[PDB]
Structure 1
């Protein structure tokens, strides 16, 4: 049936028909909701479940059909020939190759279908870099440097994705071992504490084990660890002139710069899997720009990340002896003012959570009008601070899984057998 979602602030009701198109499971049942589970088995893509000639043609036919519907040429001569072309290819090689137009369409729609992404108003503005001719980690490094340079654009960030060769037998995977192209190292200290980003302690140790000489500072850009065609991964240093960073300062608190905080301008996720028409692209780094709260709330103030609230609140001379003084909430706002101010002062693209969630509501309205719906995961869409003063808090959302999609996959060091 048609499903209605209401905004409880504006009373707008939208009617969802698009969910009728989905075939992937969510993890919920009629009797249990798993809406807050970060990784049900239905959002991940193991190298176990790579398809076969059997399973592959229906998935391919589904995608070709939706592509030719999207260009208003359903059933055309070009459509019929492409289905026959793809069928013969799967039959004689156990796989098939996307056309360039199909690859671009599939990457844009994987973003459009990402129910956890608040930035999807931009979905049709995506630069797609076809790297399917790559064969070595040196080639991967070259493609990644070009991506970083293009997407950074001297601070005027541009969304981009680079797509490396698809999975074949699961023993010749292309993988970026980094979770993002640009990230900071973390180091376990003798006294038991952590230097740098605690989230990256394990990956940092693998780089050190592979020969990386760590500077052992608080914000050391990690090297790239690149695996091509299932071989052992190889280390590379991104040229530093390509790595745009912002020193964080505060418009009012002159002492804030003395905290020594910085962050990088370019968020570039490199560990997800792109699925298009049954094909699995296990290396597909994609980049956009930051929403301020990603840095100011989560990276800086998560207890398991840089965890700076206590230091900031002390410089603010807040009463920290009782929770009900809301000293953490006060420091949190000031930290997020500093992040936005610093990026804006340096002319590095960033969006605040008020502007981003407002754009997302507009996007939802666009999608319901032209597409009949928009899958959206409230748990991820609502920002991690000031939730109910953003309009998405009051927006009912339906979450469902459409393909093409981005999926999580296992960390390669848990599956890879080395030299």
Structure 2
């Protein structure tokens, strides 16, 4: 009936009652914890009888949020949803419900350290969209609004929900802005090695690649289950930041840059049992996402050895900590570069601090805050951020952002 979490740095103890409202699996069992597993069918669309309680729980939740639970408006809405689920095997969210649902899917996203901002989310209703060109128009507008000349604003564009599973809208891109990766005959990789497969798909589909190190990939948009189509985002809408270092003159000669807008486009938004297979959302970067993961993962841009060399570090023994030392300067560079170009960014320290403040506030007013310590802790300097010392309960509330199969793994080509 109650669970406690303790910060071992401050001794503060919070009491989680919200986890009683979770209803879906974590992957853990009573005797094995799967807390570090990253991911614990198209005929799988909810039956009528499956949708009824899921819609009821979400509509109940929504009217409780606006302090209208039990109200005549609550009861009629509840009756109105059941009518559509009966007549049409599905139902349609009102705009208020869509906005509440999208905001609460972010709020419920246990892996996201940025949720102190959840209620500040621009929701673009794109459920009238019917074609890939239309999705392109919507996404360009998303990108322009969110980028806001460097003063980033978080935003989500919601395309039509799933119907039979055979007419899904999908952004085939995993993020809206990503650099291409190209494998060379000699086995080396040009660009972002994470996107080699997606770059091949685009190339095959008709895209003519510049074959450079920072080619923004084209959108690959699927509307209504049709074949996906290519669109080049207009380059004046892709805000980019050249990476220089405040102290090392040579750093700019690495020729590094990154894009300013992090925009996840491969995830599924589930509101009231409705599934929105195409719902790109964006915010602004934490420095480590670029500085530690994008640049320093061995499977990614892999510049640690490049950087440590320019730093004249001893790289024969790990215990010199050359990797660690070089990782810090890259992450300084990334933050300095964004900040100098007045492009919104947040360092892992400010971000984790904000999240602790946000978590404590969510325990006060909501009864808890599901959190994935494996994801919340930044990928460098973990214990010197306050979330490291923070105990966290992980559970799945709905509305939620979910993962879904890659479109090419399931699409049936026309």
Shorter-chain TM-score range? over 0.9
Note the C-alpha offset of 1:264: 0.1
Map 1:6-405 onto structure 2 (within 5 A). 6-40=6-40, 46-405=41-400
SS in 2 for 1:209: helix
Note the C-alpha offset of 1:52: 1.2
> Residues 338-389 of structure 1: CA distance to partner in whole angstroms, max 9, x if unpaired?
0000000000000000000000000011000000000000000000000000
Distance 1:127 1:15 in 2: 31
SS in 2 for 1:142: helix
> Residues 218-255 of structure 1: CA distance to partner in whole angstroms, max 9, x if unpaired?
11000000000000010000000000000000000000
Contact map agreement 2:243 2:257 (CA 8 A) in 1 = yes
SS in 1 for 2:302: coil
Note the C-alpha offset of 1:54: 1.2
Give the count of matched residue pairs: 414
> Residues 257-314 of structure 1: CA distance to partner in whole angstroms, max 9, x if unpaired?
0000000000000000000000000000000000000000000000000000000000
Contact map agreement 2:44 2:165 (CA 8 A) in 1 = no
Distance 2:404 2:29 in 1: 23
SS in 1 for 2:288: helix
SS in 2 for 1:84: helix
* Alignment root-mean-square deviation, CA: 0.5
Note the C-alpha offset of 1:48: 3.9
Distance 1:30 1:90 in 2: 36
SS in 1 for 2:275: strand
Distance 1:364 1:413 in 2: 37
Note the C-alpha offset of 1:417: 1.3
Distance 2:38 2:170 in 1: 22
Distance 2:313 2:273 in 1: 55
Distance 1:233 1:353 in 2: 36
Distance 2:179 2:46 in 1: 36
Contact map agreement 2:15 2:367 (CA 8 A) in 1 = yes
Could you list the runs of 5+ residues in structure 2 that have no partner in the other structure? none
Distance 2:385 2:346 in 1: 14
> Residues 42-86 of structure 1: CA distance to partner in whole angstroms, max 9, x if unpaired?
xxxx53421011100110000000000000010000000000000
TM superposition outliers: structure 1 runs of 4+ over 2 Å: 46-49
Contact map agreement 2:104 2:118 (CA 8 A) in 1 = yes
TM-score by length of 2: 1.00
Distance 2:178 2:215 in 1: 8
Contact map agreement 2:43 2:164 (CA 8 A) in 1 = no
Comparing 336-345 and 187-196, the one that deviates more: 187-196
Contact map agreement 2:109 2:401 (CA 8 A) in 1 = yes
Could you list the runs of 5+ residues in structure 1 that have no partner in the other structure? 41-45
SS in 1 for 2:152: coil
